[PDB]
Structure formats: C-alpha cells, structure tokens
C-alpha cells in the first residue's frame, strides 16, 4: 500500500527497454506514495493500468516527455509537497508531446496541494487547464501557490459536459466536473463539503470530509491514526504509543527503517547518535553523499583510503569510468575486502579489464539500500565485461531494483538467487543485452562460487 | 515553528564566512526570509532579504559582498560573507514570515555571534 518514489528529474532513463516493467514493479498495487511520482518518457500506447490505485504522493508529480495520451490518475487526492520541482511546483506537466501527446490531465480527485506550485509548460495537444481554479487546489495555509500555466496549443477542444454548474473541468467526459471545496466554504473553514456552515470539515483533515468529524474526511492534514486524523503521534512515554511514519501513526517501524527514541521511523541516524542492533534503532567510515563526501560522485585514488580496513560503510560506492581514468589500480581495490555491509547504493559503471569478476566484494553480505542510485536503484553493473558476478557473500537487498545490463560478457547471471535477496514485492532484477544464455545456485565457476 | 543558525565564528579580516538558519514545524513553507544583524548598542537592521519568487534585497553597505539564497525544500536560509570588514562584528538573527489569515507572523532565531578580527 505503500512504496517509494524515485528522483530522476528530467533525466533519460537507466535502461529504455526496462522502464515500463520498472515503473509497474514500483507503483503495482500502491496507494500512498513517499517519494515523487515521476512519470516520464512514456510510448504512444504505453498500458498505464497499475497507476489507478495511487491516492497520495508525498513529494511532487513529474509528468514529462511522455507520448501518452492520456495518464490515469483519477484516485490522487493529495499532494503532501515534501519535496519540490526546481524548488517552486509541486506538479509539473512539461513538453508532452492523432499526432500524439497527453490530450487531458483528468485529476478529477486531486483537492489539495500542502505546498508549492503548478507548472504546466509546452503541452501542444493538452485541454482544459485554463478551467481548472486552481486556488480551489492550493491550500489556504499555502505559502509558495503559484502558477504557470501555458496554454498553446496545436488544436480545437471541445466544450466540456453541460453538467457542470460552470465551465471548469477536468475532461470532456460529464463525471471529469471540477468539485470545490474551499471557494464555496461558510465561514472560515479551510475544507468543506457544501455551502452550509454545517458543512465544514475537522480542522485535521486536509483534502476535503465526507461527515463533520475527524474520522470520515478524505486525507489527514498532518498524521492518521488508525482511521483518526490527529496533528501528533501519540507519545511512546505508553502501551498506546506509536512511531510516526511519513503522515501515519504505526506501531512498529518498517523493515528498512531506524526507530528513534523521539518516535519516529528515519532513514538516517541524528548527531551525537550511534546505530543499534537488537530491528534497528539510534541510541565511522563514511560512504559517498554522507556529510563529508556529499558532492563526491566516484571512488577515486583521492578517497579510496578513507575505507581501508572498514567493515560498514554509510554511505554508497559509485566506480564511475572517470575513477578509473592518478588512475585509480586493481592493486587499490583489495581495501574492500573486508567490507561487509553498505548502508547505501552500489554502483559500478566501470570496471579494470585485468578483473574477470567482482571479486573485491568477495564478503560483502548486506546491500542496505536506504538511498537508491535515481530513487530506484541499489545494485547497477553495466558495461563491465565481466565474465561472472562472484558475489558470494551476499544475502540480502533491503531496498529497490537490481540493474545489470549491457554486459557482453556476463554469464551466471540467471544461477543467483535474486527472489531469496529480496525483502519487498517491489524489487525485482531487470537484465538486458547480456551475454545470450544459450551460448552461456551459485555466482561463478568452481566449487568455491556454490550459494 | 523554530528557527536555529549554525553559522558564527571568528574570522580574520578579508575572510569568508558562511551562515545558515533552517526551520522546523511547517508544512506549508514560508513567505520570506531575511538576515539581520545587531551592532554593540545599536537596533537590529537588515541585511539582505529574498522572497518567495527569489527576488534578492541588500543593505548598502554590504552590497557586492553580502549573498543571499534560500532552498524551500528545506525551509533554509543562507548568508554568503566575503571580504570582512571590522565593523561587520555583530549578532545575526535570522528571520522567516508566514502570511496566515490575512496577517503575517514573525519567527526569528536566537542569534549568531560573528567577530572580525
């Protein structure tokens, strides 16, 4: 019900021909989104079914460079605004596009945006979003509500239903009418569900109430709690206390997820705290992107000491082709032998030809996955020509997609246990252009290499 | 809403300094964001202010030297410092509005001590 989203703003996709199944794996059966729902780089009659359960996203909606014609999001109800596009909108509908491209946005559930903009730019076939009130949508607290909406076009739109008590809508079909519910509100009220000063909503709900209590609205303005629309989670100093989860009271956290002792699941331990082992909470070599190496980009011969003689890195391993090109040396890399666990990514885009496998991960078990290489990666080998993986260690992958592909070279990629790696119906291994298998448990040849 | 800088120090003249001032306890953002400082007995004047859209202010006497961005992904403000002067020794609040209601309310940090010399 609830998975995470990506960040590849604008960005070509990892792999063309696996971007579809990507996004179906993702977002198959999900309702609340924490991430940014990017959907980009979509073919003319690309099938879309598995987005129609999404009702929440908690960053913002990238909707880009897609030759759909139409994207079916009629359940989204609320965008939380977490995050940002260009640190201004919070839906962003940019250069989409029967000649082809996005003809209607149909958003006829969408109520409330908590925070940031709109960006509608360069939509030649798009319709009716000069109609829509957009005000309606932002929230009366909304700090950054503004708009951007143009409206060239290379074609006449048909006058939506006559159904509509004015003329804002969604679409041409009768039930895209636009519903509003805080333009016509009694009263101070934020959200209601009609003229009358009865109609109001519960000030904890956000995206607009079927009854005037905090139990019967469409969305919680800050935290659900079993059906309860509360503004805190209640205390753990308490038998009913609870971990807060993104807008969500849980018992316990997730798999992948820290407890801190404030009461919330995080990705990340605070300062001044230490990991711990019973589940895991927060009662040290640093990987890229973790507060020494934040702008760092590769493993170069500048930084591979820092992670001499480590059993637990926190932070990722990226090997770019620059690390490679002083040049960084095969005699450098046995630094990793005794690495164990990586609390981010791992990325290898380049590899030494004298290295017939990933044999300097030779102990390494655990692949964490707490950030993901674009939001939805944690293991990617392409381009490597590698003759086997030799990945003996590894037993588990807490988080996101395996990528390998374009490796010429590449057998025993199907003899892993990939199914036995994963910890979520969301992961999954997308391998192409490989070494075919016809020409092709265990990770490579010899006895040593059985899983 | 709370407001904390992580940027003072000592620096000698000519240096470079950086400060930032996050918040916390909105879901909404913010209006705008500025930068005050506060000389030994004098009142608190402005240094630099941006809106929301990102148009940029300065005071005129720290003008080309004096940067000032924020990030609403993170509810921050930042206050890039080069070539301190002497008399750029004093305390720097940091400051945020929210129009709520038809008014604006005012949240300033506890300050931030920056001692040229």
């Known amino acids: 019900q609830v998975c995470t989203g990506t960040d590849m703003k604008l960005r070509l996709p990892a792999s063309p021909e696996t971007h579809l199944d990507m996004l179906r794996h993702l977002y198959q059966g999900c309702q609340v989104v924490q991430g940014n729902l990017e959907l980009t780089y979509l073919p003319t009659n690309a099938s879309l079914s598995f987005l129609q359960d999404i009702q929440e996203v908690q960053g913002y909606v990238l909707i880009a460079h897609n030759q759909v014609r139409q994207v079916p999001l009629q359940r989204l109800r609320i965008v939380r605004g977490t995050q940002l596009f260009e640190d201004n909108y919070a839906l962003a509908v940019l250069d989409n596009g029967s000649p082809g491209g996005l003809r209607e946005l149909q958003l006829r559930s969408l109520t409330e945006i908590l925070k940031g903009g709109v960006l509608i730019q360069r939509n030649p076939q798009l319709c009716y979003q000069d109609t829509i009130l957009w005000k309606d949508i932002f929230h009366k607290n909304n700090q950054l509500a503004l708009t951007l909406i143009d409206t060239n076009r290379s074609r006449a739109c048909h006058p939506c239903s006559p159904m509509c008590k004015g003329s804002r809508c969604w679409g041409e079909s009768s039930e895209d009418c636009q519903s509003l519910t805080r333009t016509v509100c009694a009263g101070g009220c934020a959200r209601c569900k009609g003229p009358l000063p009865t109609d109001c909503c519960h000030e904890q709900c956000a995206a607009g109430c079927t009854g005037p209590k905090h139990s019967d609205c469409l969305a919680c303005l800050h935290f659900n709690h079993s059906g309860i629309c509360e503004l805190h989670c209640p205390a753990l100093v308490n038998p009913e206390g609870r971990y807060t989860f993104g807008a969500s009271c849980v018992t316990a956290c997730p798999y992948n997820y820290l407890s801190t002792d404030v009461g919330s699941c995080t990705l990340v331990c605070p300062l001044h705290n230490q990991e711990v082992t019973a589940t895991q909470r927060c009662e040290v070599c640093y990987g890229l992107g973790m507060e020494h190496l934040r702008e760092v980009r590769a493993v170069t011969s500048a930084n591979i000491q820092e992670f001499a003689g480590c059993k637990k890195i926190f932070g990722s391993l990226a090997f770019l082709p620059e690390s490679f090109d002083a040049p960084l040396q095969p005699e450098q890399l046995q630094v990793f032998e005794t690495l164990e666990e990586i609390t981010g990514y791992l990325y290898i885009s380049a590899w030494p030809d004298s290295l017939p496998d990933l044999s300097v991960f030779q102990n390494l078990q655990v692949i964490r996955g707490r950030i993901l290489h674009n939001g939805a990666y944690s293991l990617t080998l392409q381009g490597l020509g590698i003759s086997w993986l030799g990945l003996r260690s590894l037993r588990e992958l807490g988080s996101g997609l395996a990528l390998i592909h374009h490796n010429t070279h590449l057998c025993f990629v199907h003899t892993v246990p990939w199914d036995q790696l994963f910890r979520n119906p969301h992961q999954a291994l997308l391998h192409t252009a490989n070494r075919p298998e016809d020409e092709c448990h265990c990770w490579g040849p010899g006895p040593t290499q059985c899983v | 809403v709370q407001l904390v800088e992580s940027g003072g120090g000592v620096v000698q003249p000519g240096g470079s300094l950086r400060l930032s001032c996050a918040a916390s306890g909105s879901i909404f953002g913010f209006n705008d964001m500025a930068w005050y400082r506060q000389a030994p007995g004098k009142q608190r004047e402005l240094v630099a202010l941006i809106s929301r859209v990102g148009v940029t202010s300065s005071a005129d006497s720290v003008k080309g030297r004096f940067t000032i961005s924020r990030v609403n992904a993170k509810d921050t403000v930042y206050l890039q410092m080069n070539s301190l002067r002497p008399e750029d020794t004093a305390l720097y609040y940091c400051?945020?509005?929210?129009?709520?209601?038809?008014?604006?309310?005012?949240?300033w940090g506890q300050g931030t001590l920056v001692t040229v010399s």
């Open positions: 400051y945020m509005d929210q129009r709520l209601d038809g008014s604006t309310l005012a949240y």
